[PDB]
């Protein structure tokens with residue numbers, strides 16, 4: 001009966017969960033963790049990553 | 050193949066009318082979303098953290 | 100290249116059937132079918148009710164029924180010609 | 188990482204060292220030398236409205 | 238717009254992130270067939286209903302409101318005269334009572 | 337290309353978001369047609385005359 005309101009709540013929660021999940025994406029870099037990038041590379045290539 | 054509806058043939062003629070003799074008080078529900086969750090994102094913390 | 104077009108759930112035949120049902124309801128029953136059970140009414144009495152809705156007395160419709168029917172038929176024919184004759 | 192290290196009640200298995208949240212950032216860690224499990228909570232933050 | 242049927246009134250109810258409208262509507266029911274005419278011919282004059290419709294249960298003619306069956310005697314109070322009986326298609330002959 | 341798909345997996349749930357948005361649009365079109373045309377539950381027919 002109350003599918004419309006629950007649907008709106010689901011879309012908002014799902015969008016937030018996807019946005020949080022996207023931090024786990026390398027995006028074509030060696031790692032998804034910034035601290036690792038500093039701890040492992042020189043600034044000329046770390047800047048690129 | 051899904052049915053559109055039950056088939057009803059209206060008894061149309063040029064000199065006959067159908068008049069209601071009774072009534073039903075029907076209460077129906079309409080659910081409408083009004084607002085969403087208000088979300089704020091810290092751009093610097095999300096992209097870079099600490 | 101990965102693109103698919105999904106068919107509509109309602110086919111053109113069923114949409115046409117729905118329009119046919121709506122036309123049959125509005126012709127044989129007036130506005131009664133939209134508010135409840137379809138109650139039959141003669142079409143010259145339905146048109147008189149509609150004339151009363153816009154503030155014209157029933158006698159005006161009944162006395163001039165043939166002229167109004169001719170005007171309506173002419174207008175419907177003009178609509179078909181206008182749609183057939185205009186690209187835009 | 189930058190965070191507050193607190194006591195935890197999560198029953199880590201013997202092989203398990205650290206923990207990851209939905210985002211995959213580390214949320215708990217097992218310290219060397221002492222083998223204890225420390226929960227990592229990000230430091231206090233929020234929006235300032237004037 | 239405000240429920241299925243002829244709308245009477247509506248009630249608002251709060252809901253999480255939303256509103257629920259309870260639409261109270263009037264639905265006609267228990268319809269009955271009647272023989273109808275556009276006008277009543279009396280004394281060489283055509284009588285039309287002021288607010289209702291002419292109905293017949295088989296032998297007698299009455300005027301009733303369109304949305305509920307309440308037959309009343311055809312009088313000059315609830316009918317109006319426009320023209321003679323020669324123009325209206327389907328006019329029937331019946332007496333019109335005078336108060 | 338299998339290697340391209342393997343590199344595409346590094347980007348996360350972008351593909352899922354695109355598919356879900358298109359699925360929402362696709363069901364929305366059917367819902368729109370249903371709202372416009374399916375306003376009667378009785379299929380009426382005209383008399384033969």
Ligand SMILES: *[C@@H]1O[C@H](CO)[C@@H](O[C@@H]2O[C@H](CO)[C@@H](O)[C@H](O)[C@H]2NC(C)=O)[C@H](O)[C@H]1NC(C)=O
Nearest residue numbers: 058059060061065067068139267268269270271
């Ligand atoms: C008014 O009369 C008509 C016919 O005189 C009735 O229509 C018939 O209804 C039955 C039962 O639903 C059907 O089996 C017939 O096929 C219908 N005939 C036609 C010509 O449509 C109608 O039901 C009557 N109305 C009421 C309210 O009783």
Ligand SMILES: *[C@@H]1O[C@H](CO)[C@@H](O[C@@H]2O[C@H](CO)[C@@H](O)[C@H](O)[C@H]2NC(C)=O)[C@H](O)[C@H]1NC(C)=O
Nearest residue numbers: 069070071072073074075264265266267268306
């Ligand atoms: C109009 O319909 C109502 C029901 O909606 C009828 O009321 C019922 O009447 C019977 C006997 O008269 C009772 O046993 C029921 O309990 C009544 N129902 C309710 C909800 O009150 C009413 O009689 C009908 N009127 C006419 C003139 O037919």
Ligand SMILES: *[C@@H]1O[C@H](CO)[C@@H](O[C@@H]2O[C@H](CO)[C@@H](O)[C@H](O)[C@H]2NC(C)=O)[C@H](O)[C@H]1NC(C)=O
Nearest residue numbers: 271292293294295296297298299307308309310
């Ligand atoms: C149509 O309705 C009228 C009025 O309700 C009926 O006339 C009455 O019928 C009852 C029962 O037969 C008599 O006791 C009354 O004396 C009648 N009144 C008058 C003024 O004549 C009429 O019988 C109904 N016709 C049908 C076919 O049902």
Ligand SMILES: *[C@@H]1O[C@H](CO)[C@@H](O[C@@H]2O[C@H](CO)[C@@H](O)[C@H](O)[C@H]2NC(C)=O)[C@H](O)[C@H]1NC(C)=O
Nearest residue numbers: 277278279280281282322323327328329330331
């Ligand atoms: C209604 O009444 C009128 C007048 O009483 C009828 O008109 C007459 O009909 C007869 C037979 O058709 C003719 O010979 C007369 O010349 C008509 N007179 C007038 C003034 O037109 C009419 O036929 C009646 N209609 C019904 C259905 O009974």
Ligand SMILES: *[C@@H]1O[C@H](CO)[C@@H](O)[C@H](O)[C@H]1NC(C)=O
Nearest residue numbers: 062063064275326327328385
């Ligand atoms: C209704 O139709 C019948 C035949 O179909 C005809 O004899 C009668 O005169 C018509 N009545 C009206 C008012 O059109």
